[PDB]
Amino acid sequence: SLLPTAPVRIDADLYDDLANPARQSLYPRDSRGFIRIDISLRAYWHTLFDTCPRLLELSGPSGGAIFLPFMAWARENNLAFDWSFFLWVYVWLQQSEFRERLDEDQLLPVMTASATRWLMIDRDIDACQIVLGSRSLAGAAVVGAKIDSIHCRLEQVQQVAFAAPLPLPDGEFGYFLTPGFEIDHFPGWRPLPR
Amino acid sequence: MQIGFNFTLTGTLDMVQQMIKERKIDYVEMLIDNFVHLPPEQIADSFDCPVAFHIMLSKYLERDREALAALGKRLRRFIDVMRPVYVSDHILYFTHNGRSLFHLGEIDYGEYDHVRSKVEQWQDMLGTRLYLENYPSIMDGAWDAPSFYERLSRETGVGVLFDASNAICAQNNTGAPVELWKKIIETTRHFHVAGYGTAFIEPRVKADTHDREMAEDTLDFLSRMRTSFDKPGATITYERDFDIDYESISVDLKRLRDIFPCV
Numbered sequence: 430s431l432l433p434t435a436p437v438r439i440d441a442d443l444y445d446d447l448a449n450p451a452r453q454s455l456y457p458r459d460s461r462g463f464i465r466i467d468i469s470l471r472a473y474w475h476t477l478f479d480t481c482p483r484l485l486e487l488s489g490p491s492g493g494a495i496f497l498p499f500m501a502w503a504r505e506n507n508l509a510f511d512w513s514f515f516l517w518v519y520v521w522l523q524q525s526e527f528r529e530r531l532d533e534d535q536l537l538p539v540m541t542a543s544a545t546r547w548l549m550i551d552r553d554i555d556a557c558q559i560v561l562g563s564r565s566l567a568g569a570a571v572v573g574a575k576i577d578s579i580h581c582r583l584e585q586v587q588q589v590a591f592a593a594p595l596p597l598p599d600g601e602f603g604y605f606l607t608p609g610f611e612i613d614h615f616p617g618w619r620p621l622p623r
Numbered sequence: 624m625q626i627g628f629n630f631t632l633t634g635t636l637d638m639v640q641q642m643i644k645e646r647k648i649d650y651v652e653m654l655i656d657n658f659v660h661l662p663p664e665q666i667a668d669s670f671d672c673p674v675a676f677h678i679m680l681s682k683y684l685e686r687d688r689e690a691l692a693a694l695g696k697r698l699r700r701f702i703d704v705m706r707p708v709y710v711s712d713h714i715l716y717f718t719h720n721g722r723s724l725f726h727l728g729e730i731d732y733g734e735y736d737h738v739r740s741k742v743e744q745w746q747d748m749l750g751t752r753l754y755l756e757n758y759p760s761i762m763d764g765a766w767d768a769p770s771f772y773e774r775l776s777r778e779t780g781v782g783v784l785f786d787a788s789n790a791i792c793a794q795n796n797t798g799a800p801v802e803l804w805k806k807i808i809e810t811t812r813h814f815h816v817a818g819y820g821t822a823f824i825e826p827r828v829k830a831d832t833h834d835r836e837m838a839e840d841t842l843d844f845l846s847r848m849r850t851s852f853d854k855p856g857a858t859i860t861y862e863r864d865f866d867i868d869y870e871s872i873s874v875d876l877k878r879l880r881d882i883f884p885c886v
């Protein structure tokens with residue numbers, strides 16, 4: 430009735446393989462470790478595609494043609510799967526078989542998704558907004574602001590236009606953080622973490 | 624038994640205030656580190672009842688000390704303004720070799736010395752007694768966990784926030800009976816319960832999703848041992864993080880009141 434933990438015993442045995450779709454097969458299919466890894470893989474899958482459904486138009490409904498090579502490429506470049514997760518999927522897409530089908534309609538969802546993830550999970554008390562820039566988004570940025578009022582009806586992520594031209598980032602993307610909820614300085618773009 | 628509900632999203636404010644008016648819950652449990660940039664008085668004035676604190680992303684087992692201390696200081700101020708009935712956090716594994724897990728890991732309970740020293744540091748920063756929640760185990764750490772939490776509580780003075788449905792997940796997944804937790808259940812005042820789902824590819828493996836009505840074996844658990852759960856000052860937070868639907872929540876809230884009547 431229970432599923433055998435099979436060649437392992439505890440979660441710590443599986444840590445290294447929780448984000449690796451290629452090594453999942455190495456566990457017996459009827460084993461608990463195979464299931465545990467599968468719940469983890471699906472968390473990554475749904476975090477990517479539930480938030481940015483238009484990416485499935487690129488890959489098809491299974492998402493396999495993005496998800497499998499991107500997860501392999503993420504391990505290769507030792508990506509952190511931090512708030513910039515979605516931005517790094519877009520970077521991968523730019524060198525992928527899908528590179529010709531990227532437009533503003535794919536770009537803005539992944540920028541919103543990363544600004545949203547930053548403002549939901551970052552715990553730096555001293556940073557209240559993230560500002561995201563892109564070479565494919567001239568003169569604007571995507572700003573994610575932590576909640577500072579229980580009674581806001583504005584979305585926590587907005588697109589904001591700058592009156593003074595903004596330098597294009599060196600990479601596809603750049604970011605900076607602000608203390609408090611204004612943009613009263615441009616310190617220059619930082620490159621994506623990791 | 625007081626019955627609580629967890630507040631995580633600001634868009635659920637009007638619903639939670641409705642549950643307070645209709646006397647469906649008696650306190651609100653804040654996922655408080657979601658709100659560390661709000662004015663603390665605005666939260667206190669939003670809920671016409673006591674509150675309690677649940678900390679999700681302190682990551683106190685791994686976070687660097689400077690960022691951890693700043694978060695602690697901010698939370699200490701929230702504790703002064705709102706006087707939460709209790710303050711609680713987790714024993715979770717968030718990051719493997721610099722890579723964030725999106726489905727959080729069960730710590731290895733062999734690592735007691737590491738967890739002990741981190742717990743003491745974080746409890747010290749918060750300035751109050753900390754309660755630590757059990758994990759909805761999938762792998763066989765479920766068998767180690769009760770003895771681990773009792774030792775940890777003895778040596779550091781933390782309390783245990785006992786999540787009944789996480790333990791039922793652990794039992795369904797690993798065989799570890801929920802009776803292993805009897806001593807902790809008769810000790811702590813503070814409890815959690817929620818619905819759980821299943822792994823998409825294996826219905827026998829239970830996932831702690833908080834998106835669903837409480838299962839029958841979770842309800843038998845609470846009912847079978849209602850005198851062990853219920854105490855002076857006992858509280859139980861119902862958790863609903865997804866499909867946050869007013870009417871389904873009210874079914875589960877009423878079923879808890881059926882099990883734990885007011886007098």
Ligand SMILES: [Fe+3]
Nearest residue numbers: 677712713756
């Ligand atoms: Fe929790």
Ligand SMILES: [Fe+3]
Nearest residue numbers: 756786815862
């Ligand atoms: Fe819980």
Ligand SMILES: [Fe+3]
Nearest residue numbers: 786789817831
């Ligand atoms: Fe739970």
